[PDB]
Swiss-Prot record, chain A:
It comes from Homo sapiens. Its main location: cytoplasm. The keyword Cytoplasm applies. This is Translation initiation factor eIF2B subunit delta. Acts as a component of the translation initiation factor 2B (eIF2B) complex, which catalyzes the exchange of GDP for GTP on eukaryotic initiation factor 2 (eIF2) gamma subunit. Its guanine nucleotide exchange factor activity is repressed when bound to eIF2 complex phosphorylated on the alpha subunit, thereby limiting the amount of methionyl-initiator methionine tRNA available to the ribosome and consequently global translation is repressed. The chain holds residues 172 to 517 of 523 of the full protein. The lineage of its organism: Eukaryota, Metazoa, Chordata, Craniata, Vertebrata.
Swiss-Prot record, chain B:
The modification N6-acetyllysine is found at residue 27. Acts as a component of the translation initiation factor 2B (eIF2B) complex, which catalyzes the exchange of GDP for GTP on eukaryotic initiation factor 2 (eIF2) gamma subunit. Its guanine nucleotide exchange factor activity is repressed when bound to eIF2 complex phosphorylated on the alpha subunit, thereby limiting the amount of methionyl-initiator methionine tRNA available to the ribosome and consequently global translation is repressed. This is Translation initiation factor eIF2B subunit alpha. It comes from Homo sapiens (Human). The keyword GTP-binding does not apply. It holds the Pfam family IF-2B. One of its GO terms (biological process) is translational initiation.
Amino acid sequence: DYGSKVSLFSHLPQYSRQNSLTQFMSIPSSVIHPAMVRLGLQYSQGLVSGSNARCIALLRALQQVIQDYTTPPNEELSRDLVNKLKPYMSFLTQCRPLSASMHNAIKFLNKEITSVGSSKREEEAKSELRAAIDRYVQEKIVLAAQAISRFAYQKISNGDVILVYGCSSLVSRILQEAWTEGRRFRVVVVDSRPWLEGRHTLRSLVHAGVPASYLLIPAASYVLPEVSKVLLGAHALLANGSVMSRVGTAQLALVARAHNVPVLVCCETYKFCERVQTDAFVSNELDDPDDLQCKRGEHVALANWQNHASLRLLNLVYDVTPPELVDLVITELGMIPCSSVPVVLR
Amino acid sequence: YFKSQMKEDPDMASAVAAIRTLLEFLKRQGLRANLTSAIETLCGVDSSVAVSSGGELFLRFISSKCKKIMIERGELFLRRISLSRNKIADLCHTFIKDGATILTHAYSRVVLRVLEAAVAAKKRFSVYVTESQPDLSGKKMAKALCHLNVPVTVVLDAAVGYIMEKADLVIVGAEGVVENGGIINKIGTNQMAVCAKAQNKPFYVVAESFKFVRLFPLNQQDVPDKFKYHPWVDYTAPSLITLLFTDLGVLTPSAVSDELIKLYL
């Protein structure tokens, strides 16, 4: 842990970016696989921060690890591999908390490994595991976005003013595919500090030819009156109908409801978790607190904030939105309500 | 008294006609009894809250060898009531936007004057009017508004919730303003105010000062039965009203009670 945490957020880990976990490790990593080591280093340094990008990188690293995995004698691999992959996941979590996508993916991989019988050969098992990972990715990530792109194309109209927030690999694709089909609309990109990841969507839209706008989230109440729809992306859909997404989503949906604007949500079926949550206090993630430091004017005001023992710096990442503010959810199965997540989980 | 023709010229409201009749009959203490006699007689013809409000206001104003002061005060009050509408319109026409959509329920001279004063300022807007099923006054309002070069549209009384999302603001006239701040208007006003409140749509009301009635209805049944008579009037709570545009200025629903208390009616 680094720095002093908040009283209400003292049950969560607060790591740092400068403090690397590879200091107390061998350059040729013995206990940990080099692939997983570099993956955790990238996660800690922020090289891979996308919800789906993180899962894809994790699965590719796991494929690489399996490619060079030798089953010892005196034991089967169907269990040795599961027992060996656990410390890797623990190290990855120590580097950066895992996401719901990564959790579901490792669960599916463990289930598939357990489904392998000792009756089969090692090479056949490894090849089947690799092919299974490949086709699972292609289905739940690649093919799971083409159906959502043609389902949301119906709800997009000419002259619409769609409002997006943050960065999402699915929202940008939906908009870029709807623009090329014949729709002529304009997008409003909302961003928040300190990540400022909305600029990614802004650039991806400008390069596509869609008229786009950019403004910070505090001014969301000023532009919403002219907004017709609010298309948002999330990281996970809880079993209680709620939605887990970036911290600046719940208040955005609240202001949209206050302005009488229909809110939408687009998520893949593989992000349908089984747990539940009521607020952003029981399970969240506190990133490095020094990200709030900003060069405003002539000097920084939080340059030595740790000298003040009473001052705390909260850097929440995720948040939980109630089902009372979500109208429609878009998936590969079709348009379903916000209170139908358990039905899809069935 | 004489027949209902002091309203031979249509423009003029019923309350102003009743006030003129009362003032002229005053030129014919013990006045009180005679006047109460008169207000009551007057009310048989018109079951309306504005007439009773004006009568009560005149009775309070009366509060008898010194009749010069009373006649002068009545003349000045009548002139002020006549100038009421121009002030109301000039003060309310600023809350309308270019290209905005307006929603009205029934026919009213005050809202019509407001709309004409707004369109006289080089403003363009669309207005939706409810047909007013009880008596087809919404069609009359739309006909009188189509002449002013305004794209008016008539909608059914049951379709007030279907076109609520398209409307940007709601403006209607009130026959009587209750003490708490509510209004007594056509039967199809409470449902419209409720539908507008559920969508954060502003709900403005325009009314004169001679319509401040000293009542306090708790529900749709506490209102006097003589004013309702298929009822012809309903009550709307002040929590559903945004502002009130009266000859005294732009006030909140919680300001009419202050005026009635200062008046000691």
